[PDB]
Every structure is written in C-alpha cells, then in structure tokens.
Coordinates of C-alpha atoms and ligand atoms in Angstrom, one line a residue:
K1 CA 111.5 96.7 -1.3
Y2 CA 109.6 96.8 1.9
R3 CA 111.6 98.9 4.3
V4 CA 112.2 102.4 2.9
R5 CA 115.3 104.2 4.1
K6 CA 114.7 108.0 4.0
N7 CA 116.8 111.1 3.7
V8 CA 117.2 112.5 7.2
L9 CA 115.9 115.9 5.9
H10 CA 112.7 114.1 4.7
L11 CA 111.9 112.6 8.1
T12 CA 108.9 113.9 10.0
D13 CA 109.2 115.1 13.6
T14 CA 107.6 111.8 14.7
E15 CA 110.0 109.7 12.5
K16 CA 113.0 111.4 14.1
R17 CA 111.6 111.1 17.6
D18 CA 110.9 107.4 17.0
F19 CA 114.3 106.7 15.5
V20 CA 116.1 108.3 18.4
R21 CA 113.6 106.8 20.8
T22 CA 114.5 103.4 19.3
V23 CA 118.3 103.8 19.5
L24 CA 118.5 104.6 23.3
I25 CA 116.5 101.5 23.8
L26 CA 119.0 99.3 22.0
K27 CA 121.6 101.1 24.0
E28 CA 119.9 100.6 27.3
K29 CA 119.4 96.9 26.6
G30 CA 123.0 96.4 25.8
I31 CA 122.5 95.6 22.1
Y32 CA 124.0 98.8 20.8
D33 CA 127.4 98.0 22.4
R34 CA 127.5 94.8 20.4
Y35 CA 127.8 96.9 17.3
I36 CA 130.6 99.1 18.7
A37 CA 132.6 96.0 19.5
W38 CA 132.0 94.3 16.2
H39 CA 133.4 97.3 14.3
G40 CA 136.5 97.5 16.5
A41 CA 137.1 93.8 16.4
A42 CA 136.9 93.7 12.6
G43 CA 139.2 96.8 12.3
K44 CA 142.0 94.9 14.0
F45 CA 141.4 91.7 12.0
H46 CA 144.0 91.9 9.2
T47 CA 143.7 90.0 5.9
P48 CA 146.2 88.6 5.9
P49 CA 148.0 89.2 9.3
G50 CA 150.6 92.0 9.1
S51 CA 148.8 93.7 6.3
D52 CA 147.0 97.0 6.4
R53 CA 143.8 95.5 5.0
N54 CA 141.3 94.5 7.7
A55 CA 137.9 92.8 7.6
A56 CA 135.9 96.0 7.5
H57 CA 138.2 98.6 6.0
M58 CA 141.1 99.4 3.5
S59 CA 140.0 96.5 1.3
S60 CA 137.2 95.2 -1.0
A61 CA 135.0 94.0 1.8
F62 CA 134.6 97.5 3.1
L63 CA 131.3 98.0 1.4
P64 CA 129.6 94.7 1.9
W65 CA 130.8 94.5 5.5
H66 CA 129.1 97.8 6.5
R67 CA 126.0 96.8 4.5
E68 CA 125.7 93.7 6.6
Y69 CA 126.6 95.8 9.6
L70 CA 123.9 98.2 8.7
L71 CA 121.5 95.4 7.8
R72 CA 121.7 93.8 11.3
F73 CA 121.2 97.1 13.2
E74 CA 118.0 97.8 11.4
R75 CA 116.5 94.5 12.2
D76 CA 117.4 95.1 15.8
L77 CA 115.7 98.5 15.4
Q78 CA 112.6 96.9 13.9
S79 CA 112.4 94.4 16.8
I80 CA 111.7 97.4 19.0
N81 CA 109.5 99.3 16.4
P82 CA 108.6 97.8 13.0
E83 CA 107.9 101.3 11.6
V84 CA 111.5 102.4 12.1
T85 CA 114.1 102.1 9.4
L86 CA 117.6 103.4 9.1
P87 CA 117.7 106.9 7.6
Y88 CA 120.7 108.3 5.8
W89 CA 122.7 111.5 6.1
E90 CA 123.1 113.0 2.7
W91 CA 126.4 114.8 3.6
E92 CA 127.0 115.9 0.0
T93 CA 124.1 118.4 0.0
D94 CA 125.1 119.6 3.4
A95 CA 128.5 120.6 2.0
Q96 CA 126.6 123.0 -0.3
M97 CA 125.8 125.0 2.9
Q98 CA 128.3 127.7 3.8
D99 CA 128.2 126.2 7.3
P100 CA 127.1 122.5 7.2
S101 CA 126.9 122.5 11.0
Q102 CA 123.6 124.4 10.7
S103 CA 122.1 121.3 9.0
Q104 CA 118.8 120.0 10.6
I105 CA 120.5 116.7 11.4
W106 CA 122.3 118.4 14.2
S107 CA 119.1 119.7 15.8
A108 CA 118.6 119.0 19.5
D109 CA 115.7 116.6 18.7
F110 CA 117.8 114.3 16.5
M111 CA 121.6 113.9 16.7
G112 CA 122.5 116.9 18.8
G113 CA 125.1 119.5 17.9
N114 CA 128.8 120.1 17.7
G115 CA 131.2 119.7 20.6
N116 CA 131.6 122.2 23.4
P117 CA 135.1 123.7 23.2
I118 CA 135.0 124.5 26.9
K119 CA 134.5 120.9 27.7
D120 CA 137.1 119.5 25.4
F121 CA 134.5 119.2 22.7
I122 CA 132.0 117.0 24.6
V123 CA 128.6 117.1 23.1
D124 CA 126.1 118.6 25.6
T125 CA 123.1 119.1 23.3
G126 CA 120.6 116.6 22.0
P127 CA 119.6 113.0 22.9
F128 CA 123.2 111.7 23.0
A129 CA 124.7 114.5 25.1
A130 CA 127.0 113.6 28.0
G131 CA 125.0 112.3 30.9
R132 CA 122.4 111.0 28.5
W133 CA 124.7 108.7 26.5
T134 CA 127.6 106.6 27.8
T135 CA 130.5 105.9 25.5
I136 CA 133.2 103.2 25.3
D137 CA 136.9 103.4 24.4
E138 CA 139.1 101.4 22.0
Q139 CA 139.8 98.9 24.8
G140 CA 136.1 98.4 25.5
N141 CA 135.9 100.5 28.7
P142 CA 133.6 103.4 29.7
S143 CA 135.0 106.7 28.3
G144 CA 132.8 109.5 29.6
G145 CA 130.8 111.0 26.8
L146 CA 130.4 111.6 23.0
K147 CA 132.7 114.2 21.4
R148 CA 132.4 116.1 18.1
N149 CA 134.5 118.8 16.5
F150 CA 133.2 119.7 13.0
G151 CA 135.9 120.5 10.4
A152 CA 138.6 121.1 13.0
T153 CA 141.3 119.5 10.9
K154 CA 143.3 120.7 7.9
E155 CA 143.0 117.4 6.1
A156 CA 139.2 117.6 6.2
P157 CA 137.9 121.1 6.8
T158 CA 134.8 120.4 4.6
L159 CA 132.4 117.6 3.8
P160 CA 132.6 115.8 0.5
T161 CA 130.6 117.5 -2.4
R162 CA 127.9 116.2 -4.8
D163 CA 130.6 116.3 -7.5
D164 CA 132.9 114.2 -5.4
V165 CA 130.1 111.6 -5.2
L166 CA 129.2 112.0 -8.9
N167 CA 132.8 111.4 -10.0
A168 CA 133.1 108.2 -7.8
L169 CA 129.9 106.8 -9.5
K170 CA 131.7 107.1 -12.9
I171 CA 134.3 104.5 -11.9
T172 CA 133.8 101.3 -13.9
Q173 CA 135.5 98.7 -11.7
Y174 CA 134.2 97.8 -8.2
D175 CA 137.8 97.3 -7.1
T176 CA 141.2 96.5 -8.4
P177 CA 144.4 94.7 -7.2
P178 CA 146.1 94.8 -4.8
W179 CA 142.6 95.2 -3.2
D180 CA 143.7 97.8 -0.6
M181 CA 144.2 101.5 0.2
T182 CA 146.5 101.8 -2.9
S183 CA 144.0 100.5 -5.5
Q184 CA 143.5 102.8 -8.5
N185 CA 140.4 103.3 -10.7
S186 CA 138.6 101.6 -7.9
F187 CA 135.0 102.5 -6.9
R188 CA 135.3 101.0 -3.4
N189 CA 138.7 102.7 -2.7
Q190 CA 137.4 105.9 -4.2
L191 CA 134.2 105.8 -2.1
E192 CA 136.1 104.6 1.0
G193 CA 138.2 107.7 0.5
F194 CA 141.8 106.7 0.0
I195 CA 142.3 108.3 -3.5
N196 CA 144.2 111.5 -2.6
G197 CA 142.6 111.0 0.9
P198 CA 140.9 111.9 3.0
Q199 CA 137.9 112.0 0.6
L200 CA 134.2 111.0 0.7
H201 CA 133.6 108.4 3.5
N202 CA 137.0 108.8 5.2
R203 CA 136.6 112.6 4.9
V204 CA 133.2 112.5 6.7
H205 CA 134.6 110.7 9.7
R206 CA 137.5 113.2 9.9
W207 CA 135.2 116.1 9.5
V208 CA 132.8 115.1 12.3
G209 CA 135.7 114.5 14.7
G210 CA 135.5 113.1 18.2
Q211 CA 134.8 109.4 18.4
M212 CA 133.8 109.5 14.7
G213 CA 137.4 110.5 13.9
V214 CA 139.0 107.2 14.9
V215 CA 138.1 103.7 13.6
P216 CA 137.6 101.7 16.8
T217 CA 135.3 104.2 18.5
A218 CA 133.3 105.8 15.6
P219 CA 130.1 103.8 16.2
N220 CA 129.8 105.5 19.6
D221 CA 128.2 108.3 17.6
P222 CA 124.7 107.2 16.3
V223 CA 125.3 109.4 13.2
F224 CA 127.8 106.7 12.2
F225 CA 124.9 104.6 11.0
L226 CA 123.3 107.6 9.2
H227 CA 126.6 108.2 7.6
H228 CA 127.2 104.7 6.4
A229 CA 123.5 104.4 5.2
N230 CA 124.4 107.2 2.8
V231 CA 127.6 105.4 1.9
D232 CA 125.5 102.2 1.3
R233 CA 123.0 104.3 -0.8
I234 CA 125.8 105.5 -3.0
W235 CA 127.1 102.0 -3.5
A236 CA 123.5 100.8 -4.4
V237 CA 123.3 103.6 -7.0
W238 CA 126.6 102.5 -8.5
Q239 CA 125.1 99.0 -8.7
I240 CA 122.0 100.1 -10.5
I241 CA 124.1 102.1 -13.0
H242 CA 126.8 99.5 -13.6
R243 CA 124.5 96.5 -13.7
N244 CA 127.0 94.0 -15.2
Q245 CA 129.8 95.1 -13.0
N246 CA 130.3 92.7 -10.1
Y247 CA 132.2 92.5 -6.8
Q248 CA 135.9 92.1 -7.0
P249 CA 137.9 90.1 -6.2
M250 CA 136.0 86.9 -7.2
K251 CA 138.9 84.8 -6.1
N252 CA 142.7 85.0 -5.4
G253 CA 142.2 87.9 -3.1
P254 CA 143.2 87.8 0.6
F255 CA 140.9 85.4 2.5
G256 CA 137.9 87.4 3.8
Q257 CA 138.0 89.7 0.8
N258 CA 136.8 87.3 -1.9
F259 CA 133.2 87.2 -3.1
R260 CA 132.5 83.8 -1.4
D261 CA 134.5 84.5 1.8
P262 CA 133.0 84.9 5.3
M263 CA 133.3 88.5 6.3
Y264 CA 134.7 88.5 9.8
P265 CA 133.3 88.6 12.3
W266 CA 130.4 86.9 10.8
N267 CA 129.8 84.1 8.3
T268 CA 128.1 86.5 6.0
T269 CA 129.8 86.8 2.5
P270 CA 129.9 89.7 0.1
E271 CA 127.7 87.6 -2.1
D272 CA 124.9 87.4 0.6
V273 CA 124.5 91.2 0.5
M274 CA 125.3 92.3 -3.1
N275 CA 121.6 93.0 -3.9
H276 CA 120.3 95.6 -1.4
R277 CA 116.7 94.7 -2.4
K278 CA 117.0 91.0 -1.5
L279 CA 117.7 92.1 2.0
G280 CA 114.3 93.7 2.3
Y281 CA 115.1 97.4 1.9
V282 CA 115.2 100.2 -0.6
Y283 CA 116.2 103.9 -0.6
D284 CA 113.6 106.6 -1.1
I285 CA 115.4 108.0 -4.1
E286 CA 114.8 104.7 -5.9
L287 CA 111.1 105.3 -5.8
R288 CA 111.1 109.0 -6.8
Ligands
LIG301 C1 144.5 107.8 8.0 C2 143.6 108.2 6.8 C3 143.9 108.0 5.5 C4 143.0 108.3 4.5 C5 141.8 108.9 4.8 C6 141.4 109.1 6.1 C7 142.3 108.8 7.1 C8 141.9 109.0 8.6 O1 142.6 109.6 9.4 N1 140.6 108.5 9.1 C9 140.2 108.8 10.5 C10 138.7 108.7 10.7 N2 138.2 107.7 10.0 C11 138.5 106.5 10.5 C12 137.3 105.5 10.3 C13 137.2 104.8 9.1 C14 136.1 103.9 9.0 C15 135.2 103.8 10.0 F1 134.1 102.9 9.9 C16 135.4 104.5 11.2 C17 136.4 105.4 11.4 C18 138.2 107.8 8.7 C19 139.7 107.8 8.2
LIG302 CU1 133.9 101.0 9.6
LIG303 CU1 133.0 104.6 8.3

C-alpha cells in the first residue's frame, strides 16, 4: 500500500513530466527493450505447443502475467526515480467523449497524439514521436518509429465503455475450462476481450492501432503500460468484490497456466502476484 498508482487525468504536470522523463531513460539505458522482447517471447510460447494459448495471452495466465510484467517495470522506474509510479489510462471514461482522441493523455507533454496520415500514421507529436523514440519490429530489429491510428478499424471503432467494464466485474468465475479464448462466463476471458471480441482489453489495442494493434510490437508504445495498468486495476477491483473467488485453474490446466506454475519467461507464478497489495502498490480509487 506504499506505491500509489494514479489515474492519468489526476496526474500533475510535474508527475507527467517525471513519468515521461523516467521512461526515455529506461529506453536510453536499454532496459525498456527488455520488456518489448519479454512480451513478444511469451506471445510465441504456447501452452502446450500447437495450441493457441500462450504464456501471456488467450489463457488464464493473461492477468497475472501482465501484473508481474507491470510489477517489474515500475521497480525499474523507481530505480531511476522513487517518486514515480505507473499511472493508468481509464479508457472507459474516455469512451464517454464524442471524440476520445481529444483526451488529455494524448497531449504533447505526455503520450503524444494520433498518427500522421501523410506519414503512414507515424506519430510526430509528443515525447515518443519519430526521431525521439526508436522502435523495434516483431523480429527484434529497428523499425523506424511509433505509429497510431485511433478507431480506424470496423471491429473496434470505439473504446470499451464503463458499462462494458461493469458487466465484466459481475462475472463470478475467474476463468473456466478449456482455459482459452473460448471460455464462457469467464472474467479473465471477458476482460481479455474474446467474448464477442474484440472487447475491453483487446478492443483497446485494436482501437489505438499502430504497434499497439499487434501482439509482438505493442509495448513499443509507452501507453501499453498505462493501458494494462488500467486492466490490472479492473482485475484488482474484481478481486476485492469477489473475495472468496480464486485463480483458476488450480491444477490440471496446461503447464504454465496453473496457480503454482512458473509464468514463462520467468519463474514467477500466478500465486506470487494474486494480491496486488503484497507487491507494494495500490490504486488511488482504493483510497477514495
Ligand atoms: C484477433 C483478435 C481476436 C479477438 C480480439 C482481438 C483480436 C485482435 O485482432 N487483436 C490485435 C491487437 N491486440 C493484440 C494484442 C493483445 C495483447 C497484447 F498485450 C498486445 C497486443 C489485441 C487483439
Ligand atoms: Cu500482452
Ligand atoms: Cu494487452
């Protein structure tokens, strides 16, 4: 309950400056790239081989994997500046806007704006604009700049709504067999966004576009972490409401998906990260 993770819209000018100031540093040192690679590596690690489940997505481990993923990044952030925590992008309230792209998160002093259609949707405003921020492709090679294209697809023309989030929180089971994209009455799958997809988490990625629109290159966009922080916040809320509901599967799931299994590419288990408070952080909405 030490580190407080704040709503992006609640950040001060200084807090925003410091966060962005801290991220380019991780990037400059070569630490940021470690996170891009981890995500891509886990995405291609199938549980079991030949299945469409992987270590980080389309399965039960989706939530704890990104929580650990998000946990590690923050610590790296703190190592540069102990006053800096990972904020979250409350995309459900942005969806209430007629044009979500006018949200403050996309201001030139924080995340920067939408892609330039003249430059094939390269981002040329903000701290992470092309020439300020180098990107890497699926194969781990330099790719030439961040891209974004808000609501440019028919499958996801809009961001998920507060109701979408509220309905997900109603689900009683954390997850259900066969522990994958096809799971029904499943909070993880629902939140992931595979129920009548794309919805929620998956919808956000699709909405943003650019690197965020594909699994192996999504972390190239710093907003990926703000996004998943919100996803993690939602999960945390679900945990506080359904206090006696626990992670599933406990056993007999694919290896890497069970409660006591190491979540590739780490040795961290879902168990090790079930309680968001034991990891040393809390969301601001828990204190209000
Ligand atoms: C194929 C499909 C089926 C259902 C819902 C969405 C989609 C889809 O096209 N996505 C493309 C964009 N990301 C991919 C993605 C997922 C998780 C990440 F950490 C990073 C990137 C979200 C899902
Ligand atoms: Cu992911
Ligand atoms: Cu994601």
